[PDB]
C-alpha cells in the first residue's frame, strides 16, 4: 500500500510494480479480445446457424484461449 | 545553512513529486486496460445468455 | 526574502504531495475492485462454457 | 490525464473524479457478485438437474441483474 510507503526507494519499487502489472494486464486485454471474438462466432453457430458467421467454432476453441489466460494468472 | 537545508528538501520533494506522477500514469493505464477487459467479458456474458434462450 | 519564497514553495509542494498520495489510494481501490469484478466475470464465462458442453 | 494536470485546483478535481469512479465501481462489484451467484445456480440447473442447487433459475433472472448493470453504466 502507498499509505505505508515513504521514501525514494519505496516509491521506485512501487512504480516498478505498477508498470509490470500494467504490461501483464495489457497482455490480458489482447487475449480477452480474442476470447470475445471466438465467443461471438460461437453464439453465431446457434443464433445464426445458416449464416456465413457460423464458422464451426466450438467451446473447445474458446477453452484453448481460457488456458492461455490461466498461464498469465499463474 | 538552514536555507541550503531547506533547499535540499525542495529537491527531495521534487523527485518524489516526479515519481508520484509517473506512478499515476501507470495506474491510469491499468484502470483503462481493465475497463476494456471488463467490457469484453460483459459482452461475452450477455451474448452467451442471449444464445441460451435459443 | 528568497528563504521565505523557498519556504513558501515547500508548503506548496507538501500539499501537492498530500493530494497525490490520497489520489493514489483511491486508484489502488479502483484497481482492486476492478480485479474482483474481472474474476467474477471470468468465473461466469467459464461456468457457462462448461455448461454448454452438457 | 494527470500529465496535463498541474496545480492545486486540477489535482483536487482529479482526486474527486477518482473517488466518484471508485464508489461507482464498488457498486459494480456488488452487482457482479449477484450475477455470478445467479449464473452458478443457472448452470446447476443443467449440469446438476437433480441436485438441491437446481433452484429454478432462468436466464431472465440473470438478465434482471444485467438491467441494473446497464443503469450504472448510463
Q: Which of D9, D58, A12, A41 is nearest to B53 (CA)?
A: D58
Domain, as residue range, for B51:
1-54
- Cell reading at A11: 516509491
Helix A59-72, helix C2-52: angle, nearest 10: 150
> Would you say residue A19 lies in a domain?
yes
How near does any CA of chain C get to the CA of B34, in Å?
A: 7
Q: Could C26 and D39 be called an inter-chain contact, meaning their C-beta atoms sit closer than 8 Å?
A: no
Residue found under cell 500494467: A22
Look up residue C49 and give its three cell numbers. 462454457
**D19 part of a folded domain:** yes
The answer to whether the CB of C28 falls within 8 A of the CB of A2 is yes
Cell of D46: 443443467
DSSP one-letter code for D58: -
Query: ∠A13-A15-A16 over CA atoms, to 5°?
Result: 65
Write out the three cell numbers for B12.
527531495
Would you state the cell numbers that stand for residue D73, as one nine-digit string? 453504466
Side-chain half-sphere of B30: how many Cα atoms within 13 Å?
Answer: 25
For residue A44, give the chain B residue with the closest CA.
B51
What is the spatial distance between Cα C30 and Cα C17, in angstroms, rounded to a whole number?
20
Asked whether residue A67 is domain-assigned, the answer is yes
Cβ contact A15:B19 at 8 Å: yes
The domain tally of chain B equals 1
The parent domain of residue D55 ranges over 8-72
Determine whether the interchain pair A8/B19 forms a contact, defined as Cβ–Cβ distance below 8 Å: yes
Q: How far apart are the first and last CA of chain B?
A: 80
Give, to the nearest 10 degrees, the angle between helix A59-72 and helix A8-47: 180
Burial B18-53 (b: 16+ CB within 10 A, else e): ebbbbbbbbbbbbbebbebbbebbbebbbbbbebbe
Nine cell digits for residue B41: 467479458
Task: Please state the domain count of chain D.
Answer: 1
The technique by which this structure was obtained is: X-ray
CA distance A72 to C5: 51
Task: Please answer whether residues C37 and D28 qualify as being in contact, where contact means their C-beta atoms are separated by less than 8 angstroms.
Answer: yes
End-to-end CA distance of chain D: 22
Please report whether residue D2 resides in a domain: no
Query: Which three cell numbers mark D69?
Result: 448493470
User: Using CB atoms, which residue from D2, D62, D63 is nearest to B25?
Assistant: D2
Q: Which three cell numbers stand for residue D16?
A: 474527486
Contact flag for B and C (3+ C-beta pairs < 8 Å)? yes
Cell of B53: 434462450
Amino acid at each position: 500500500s502507498i499509505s505505508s510507503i515513504s521514501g525514494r526507494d519505496d516509491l521506485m519499487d512501487y512504480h516498478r510494480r505498477q508498470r509490470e502489472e500494467r504490461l501483464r494486464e495489457q497482455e490480458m486485454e489482447r487475449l480477452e479480445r480474442q476470447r470475445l471474438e471466438t465467443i461471438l462466432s460461437l453464439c453465431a453457430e446457434y443464433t445464426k446457424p445458416d449464416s456465413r458467421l457460423s464458422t464451426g467454432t466450438t467451446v473447445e476453441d474458446v477453452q484453448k484461449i481460457n488456458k492461455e489466460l490461466e498461464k498469465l494468472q499463474l | 545553512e538552514n536555507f541550503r537545508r531547506l533547499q535540499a528538501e525542495h529537491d527531495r520533494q521534487a523527485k518524489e513529486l516526479f515519481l508520484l506522477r509517473k506512478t499515476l500514469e501507470e495506474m491510469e493505464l491499468r484502470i483503462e486496460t481493465q475497463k476494456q477487459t471488463l467490457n469484453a467479458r460483459d459482452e461475452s456474458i450477455k451474448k452467451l445468455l442471449e444464445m441460451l434462450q435459443s
